Amino acid sequence: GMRVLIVEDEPYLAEAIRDGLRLEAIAADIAGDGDTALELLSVNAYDIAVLDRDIPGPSGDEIAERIVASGSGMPILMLTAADRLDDKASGFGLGADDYLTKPFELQELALRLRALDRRRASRPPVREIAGLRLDPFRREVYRGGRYVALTRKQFAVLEVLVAAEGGVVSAEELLERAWDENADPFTNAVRITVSALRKRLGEPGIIATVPGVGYRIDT
């Protein structure tokens, strides 16, 4: 079977999709808003995300962006009233794998879900090591079971270090992966963020400097 997430803020439509797919071995969870969608993604694995664009809270576009950035490789189908060519351009630009406009035919949605699921490949990024557990959908961190509040940028840097599994990551790579490609900050922004991150995580030290190279999670 298949498990899919339906993010759609018109409730009778979302329920009709879930209901219409169920006996064809596609089990769907429904989120009526962006915050609920992130809550579901933080705890459940899905085969496909079906995303409305205009929803309360964080938009379907922001959900898509977080899915792509999480490196799960979960395919994204946008299902939306935004039907202009400009809308398709921005949707595919955000990382959608398919784009279906309303009004739509349920059996076409089903055919496209099956086609997406067939061509999904793999290795999800490591998000847990050395007593740290990271959740990229809520941007939350627990260290030995204790919630640690971090800023967005602190979390982005910690994510890269944890994904590296104890391996070394240079300041230049942290720059590339945690600041936008069209940004060009200097390495001092990275070193300053690492210092703040260390202070948030507390003792004992868990991020090690490797002189002249970069930083690693101390395993």
Q: Strand, coil or helix: what is 217? A: strand
Q: Give the number of other Cβ atoms within 10 Å of residue 153's Cβ.
A: 16
165 lies in the site for Mg ion, by CB under 5 A: no
Query: Of these, 30, 31, 41, 82, which contacts ligand BEF (CB under 6 A)?
Result: 82
What mask of x and - would describe binding to ligand BEF in positions 45 to 64, judged by CB under 6 A?
-------xxx----------
Q: How many residues line the site for ligand BEF (CB under 6 A)?
A: 7
How far is Cα 217 from Cα 167, in angstroms, rounded to an integer? 7
Site residues (CB under 6 A) for ligand BEF, limited to 87-106: 102
54 lies in the site for Mg ion, by CB under 5 A: yes
Query: Of these, 2, 3, 9, 200, which contacts Mg ion (CB under 5 A)?
Result: 9
Q: What DSSP letter does each residue of 165-212 carry, written as one string?
A: TT--EEHHHHHHHHS-TTT---HHHHHHHHHHHHHHH-SSP-EEEETT
Is 83 labelled as part of a ligand binding site? no
159 lies in the site for Mg ion, by CB under 5 A: no
Is 98 labelled as part of a ligand binding site? no
183 lies in the site for ligand BEF, by CB under 6 A: no
Query: Cα-Cα-Cα-Cα dihedral of 110, 63, 140, 134, to 10°?
Result: 50
Tell me the HSE value of 7 on the side-chain side, using a 13 A CA sphere.
31
Binding residues for Mg(2+): 8-9, 52, 54
Q: Which residues contact Mg ion (rule: CB under 5 A)?
A: 9, 52, 54
